[PDB]
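Hi support team,

I'm filing this because I wasn't sure whether my run with MFX finished correctly. The job status page said complete, but I'd like someone to confirm that the output block is well-formed before I use it downstream. Pasting the exact inputs I used:
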Amino acid sequence: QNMSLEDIMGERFGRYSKYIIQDRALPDIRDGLKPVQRRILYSMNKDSNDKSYRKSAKSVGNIMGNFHPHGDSSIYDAMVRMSQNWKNREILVEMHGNNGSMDGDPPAAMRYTEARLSEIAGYLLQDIEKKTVPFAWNFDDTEKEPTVLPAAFPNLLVNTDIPPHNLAEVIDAAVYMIDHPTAKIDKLMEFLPGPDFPTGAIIQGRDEIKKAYETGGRVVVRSKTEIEKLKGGKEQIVITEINKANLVKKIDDVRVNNKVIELTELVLNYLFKYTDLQINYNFNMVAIDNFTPRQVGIVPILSSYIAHRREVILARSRFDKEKAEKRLHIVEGLIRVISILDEVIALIRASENKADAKENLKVSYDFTEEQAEAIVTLQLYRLTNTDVVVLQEEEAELREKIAMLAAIIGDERTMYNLMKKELREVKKKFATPRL
Amino acid sequence: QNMSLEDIMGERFGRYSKYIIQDRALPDIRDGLKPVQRRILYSMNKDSNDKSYRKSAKSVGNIMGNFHPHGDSSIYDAMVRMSQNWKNREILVEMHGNNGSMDGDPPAAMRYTEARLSEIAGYLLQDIEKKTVPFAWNFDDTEKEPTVLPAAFPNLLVNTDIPPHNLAEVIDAAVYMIDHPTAKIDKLMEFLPGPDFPTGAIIQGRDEIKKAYETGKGRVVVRSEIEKLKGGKEQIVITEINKANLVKKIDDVRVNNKIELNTELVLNYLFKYTDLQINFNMVAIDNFTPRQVGIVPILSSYIAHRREVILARSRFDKEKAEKRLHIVEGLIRVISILDEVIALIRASENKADAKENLKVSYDFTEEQAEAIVTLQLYRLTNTDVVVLQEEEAELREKIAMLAAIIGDERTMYNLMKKELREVKKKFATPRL
Amino acid sequence: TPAQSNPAKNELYLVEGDSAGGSAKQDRKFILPLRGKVINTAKAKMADILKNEEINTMIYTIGAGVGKIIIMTDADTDGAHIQTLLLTFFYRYMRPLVEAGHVYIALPPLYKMSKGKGKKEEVAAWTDGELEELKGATLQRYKGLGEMDQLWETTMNPETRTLIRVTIEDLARAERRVNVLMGDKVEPRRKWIEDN
Amino acid sequence: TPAQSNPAKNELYLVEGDSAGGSAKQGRDRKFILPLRVINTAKAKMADILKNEEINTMIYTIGAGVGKIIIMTDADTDGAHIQTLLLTFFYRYMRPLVEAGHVYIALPPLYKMSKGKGKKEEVAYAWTDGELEELKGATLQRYKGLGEMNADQLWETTMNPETRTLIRVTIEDLARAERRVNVLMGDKVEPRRKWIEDN
DNA sequence: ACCAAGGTCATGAAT
DNA sequence: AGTCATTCATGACCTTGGT
DNA sequence: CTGTTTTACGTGCAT
DNA sequence: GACTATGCACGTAAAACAG
Ligand SMILES: COc1c(N2C[C@@H]3CCCN[C@@H]3C2)c(F)cc2c(=O)c(C(=O)O)cn(C3CC3)c12
Ligand SMILES: COc1c(N2C[C@@H]3CCCN[C@@H]3C2)c(F)cc2c(=O)c(C(=O)O)cn(C3CC3)c12
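And here is everything the job wrote out:
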């Protein structure tokens, strides 16, 4: 039956709804990875990429059939994007084989490029390992996929528009915010005088940025221009997040229309505002926080990312702690077992089955299953239980860490001292100059 | 230094040489898989594809960066090819999502198609598992790649041109050839009266095929309904060619006035000019060297190709047993003195210390000693007290048979029969 | 670009991309693949629209102009924007087409269920509350009009799926369509996602 | 389709496909370039060849006609057929071009060797056969054809011209037009099947 | 040809 | 292995606008 | 308006 | 996400060859 007639007041309300929640495929206030990104950084993980350069086809293919239903070249294309040093500050993936010029260069299909996860790249995916950030389901429902990678390097404001700001300034403020919660935008700009671009050079608008950092405005940006004197007595002033694709001809357009380049310094001033050789910039602070799309600013962003780690660290605590507990307990058990290795090696022979053997360790002990397990899963090697005295030592080794970790659990103040030493750590290793 | 000037009598001899050994990327007299093929059937293996339909991107990607430097769509494209039922007899890969019409249908990129290894597909890759066919190196030098998958189903003459011939007729002859070696082409055509095409219908040329089967070159023939409509008019319409140009080719006859619209001579005109009833070039690579063969060679080498597959699966599986009966043979003994042994393996010293010290109270070997120490306190419940005893004969039987396949030329073929018969039946095809 | 065919029941299925319009052209026309995202009608100029081969090719096939056309998307939330527009493209222009209500928006399958690995045991448009009616076996989930012979489950039984559109529209709804899609001043759209 | 540039040293590098001619146009550490994306000269008709944008675009850039052009392939045995033809395409037509011998066929790298996973330690070799032995504990590569070499690396065959190239045609003569009508172009089949008696 | 509205072009991740 | 149009938003630079 | 040679069209795997 | 030329061989159906 051709049933179910419906209102275009109906159907265009319901379809367009679906499609608009497909506009939370936009950078999160925490990871600052927009899913089509998040997923390519994880699939390059899971598959183990410090190693050699893995082609692409395989790399994208594997991204493209486990975590992303959408296009191939839609996927990979976006990846190339993360390859372009002159697009990000920390390039969250290094490839080789014609990334693509600032000179309008079409990059080559998957068939040619080989890539690999990048240094700073490590960072963000640097603790998925444990039950850190909360992971969700595959679309195929095969593997599981993470909902925002936990993140060392503050990709969010170091990369809706949010311009680069340089690991250097970012973790520096990051520091401050922590030990001092309530902060003014004016004292925190002291650390991040402005956004660093790969092609920084000069950015003008002190009072313009200053307000923008809470309002979430318009700055200014000037070229890398040079003053020097050629031979024979002529002027030599030439050029060293824009695009060199149209500025190459844009220079030579001035000359073609003779309406004003190592051929009057007022003259440079004409091109320096009309030739698009000193355009820029805008800023449109906009992400998704609280699974809900919002404009924020320099204080929110750092604010939520501080909170985002508060719970990463707390997790890496609560977990690693439980893993220890679980270990010290078969250690704590195996030690005991040494005392009566003889008797134990006894009934485990005359016992009966496999599952028969552990049960029968209700007598001459009170050990638990996980206690009993390894006592039976052992192998006649380790019956050389040399740990007679060692295992004793472990009881304190692994009990120390279970003293610390659990201490990170109540210790609000110790906690941040972590998030410091770490953030400082990247500050240094994967630390950047200035621009 | 811009050194090394050379003769175009030189350079055009040396380059063009390289390129011409890139024309042994052509079907082998055995697998009948041309490498760009061989490699996609293996990569779909290794990765485990009876399971669900795995996309493509991943599938081709993985083919395309472990076993094949060349293009993506060059790779996959060829794959689609193996998907087309109306291209092969046994489709050595089943996909889903618009394979492509006989009606000139562009198939969709990797972004859409999902595929999976096919039934008969299994066959060929059905014993790579062991040290069967001899495998070579990756180009990256990462994994290793096989040089001709060993092959159950005679892909070679069931699929340089070689037309379909139907698993049915093929393994049937295959049978004969074995138990009777020297055979005439005339008595063997009794089993394969001709090539079956997916769109068989009618093929004319009895004396033309007959000679071709040894000559490895010739030309056959192939033909494309009679009924009466209402009101009193003629109704004669149509049900390895191509329906892409025969659709318009019919309507070309009408356009130039030179099809259920009444002379039967008329159909005769189209049935020779309209391409509605339009060769063979037996050519592959044998002895790693490109040759023309025929119905006798092909079956001849493929018989020999298995001779050595079976021999391998023998020599190997045999050695795997020997190696097992020996730690069984050992562990049994060990039961006798589980007590004493459970002894010095405590007071012993290290790990490597423990096995050595089993120079005394025994004469076991390393592989003997290993599992005696790799054991786990579970199995110290060595219930096999009496079982292991039984194994000594279980695994010693198979090592009696297998090794017997090694000298028994006659028993050997009786294998290759029961098997080939086996596919004959399971993955067996009707006729056409 | 069309797919061949006496206007006895109209009949004109509108697929998404040559994969769909390819899978379709291969079991029930008494077809024209729309390629990429169509133009947002109220999003540009009339001269604009006449320049767009998607508006053009469309109005070519079947006369009409300004003064059973089934429309087949996928499940993609991407696939909606391609319902969303076309209806606007069938609305702002070609009013009576759906004012009569001859146009209908096809109801693709969601989750197919499988079973026997050789005996074949398939099934079949809401994997939400619907799917419960169907362990031990297997499942799927449909990724959009393409990875689907099967195609005659939405193909060769027309009423077996389709959904008739526009019924008792009226006015004050042209209010929302200049609000939701097309191209407002941004303000309105940001605003309709107060019910989002 | 060209790549920009006073004929002081000629200079015209012929790459294979826009990936190479893209990697090169970026790595122009040495343009004193045009992607070739070719017909077998002796394989068709003169009218034929004039219809082919590959013959056309070629003879366009740089005048000459009928009456340092470096040519950069890959390692692909696929990449030879694209040496093989062009030379014929530089030979049957544009004779003096290589009769003078001004054309040369670039000597790409084979196997690059690596080492430190952070200290960077690269190498180079244009024969991974007998040559490669001159170079455990470290790592290796094998070069898959003019492309996977970044634009920077690309100056290993790019920005030192003589650091690689190979000058061509020297002391040709005749009785060699014999073999080039035999080998490539398009014989009667018989001859070709026949030259692979030395194959 | 002024000074102003309108019109275009561009940028990432999708079809 | 590039070609090509459009969505979706938002801005500065060019095309019309009139007399 | 013939009968001949000649010419382009097609197909899988690559570029 | 479908256009597009070409080589590699080898058949042959459709154009051009003359007076
Ligand atoms: C030229 O853009 C694309 C088109 N077309 C738009 C053109 C203009 C109008 C007439 N149709 C053509 C076809 C298409 F049909 C599919 C894809 C596609 O699948 C894809 C990917 O993710 O794999 C990437 N792109 C591009 C971003 C590279 C596609
Ligand atoms: C249209 O053929 C291709 C071309 N071109 C030939 C065209 C006509 C002449 C003017 N140039 C264009 C470009 C190309 F340049 C690269 C590839 C390619 O990489 C590839 C694959 O293995 O991925 C598959 N194919 C086709 C088999 C699908 C390619």
